[PDB]
Amino acid sequence: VLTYYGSPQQRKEKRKGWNKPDAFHVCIVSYQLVVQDQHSFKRKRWQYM
DNA sequence: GAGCTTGCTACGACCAATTGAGCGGCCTCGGCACCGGGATTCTCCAGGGCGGCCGCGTATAGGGTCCATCACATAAGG
């Protein structure tokens, strides 16, 4: 489980490695960051939402 | 070479009428925007090591400093 929250520098530090297969099983994120960071989530494919 | 008076023409102000280039509306897929990644590359303190320079102090090379030795023609006897 990846908890995607924090200030942008640590936020992008948490992004590091997201593209690798099986880097994580589930990601949990808040709607504020979804409206903030939409590009990152939209680029990845998220199976069951 | 400039100023201006010429005598007047030829080209452009003005006008109906046609029509097609250009504008206004609308629609779209690929040029763009973001960054994940491996790789590039530059920063900056530590510092191996020579050795400039400094430190304890070995033993040593050298200068300003004080000492004098030395020359021209002279003092003396006959």
CA(A31)–C1'(B77) in Å?
142
| Angstrom distances, CA of residue A21 to CA of A5, A8, A26, A30 | 21, 24, 12, 23
The reported resolution of this PDB entry, expressed in Å, is 4.4
Kindly give the interhelix angle for A8-15 and A31-43, rounded to the nearest 10 degrees.
Answer: 40
Name A28's bridge partners. Answer: A3
What one-character DSSP code corresponds to residue A45? Answer: -
CA-CA distance, A40 to A22, in Å (whole number)?
Answer: 17
Technique used: cryo-EM
Determine the nucleotide nearest to A44 by Cα–C1' distance. Answer: B36
C-alpha–C-alpha distance, residues A26 and A40, integer Å: 15
What pairing do the DSSP bridges indicate for beta strands A27-29 and A2-4? parallel
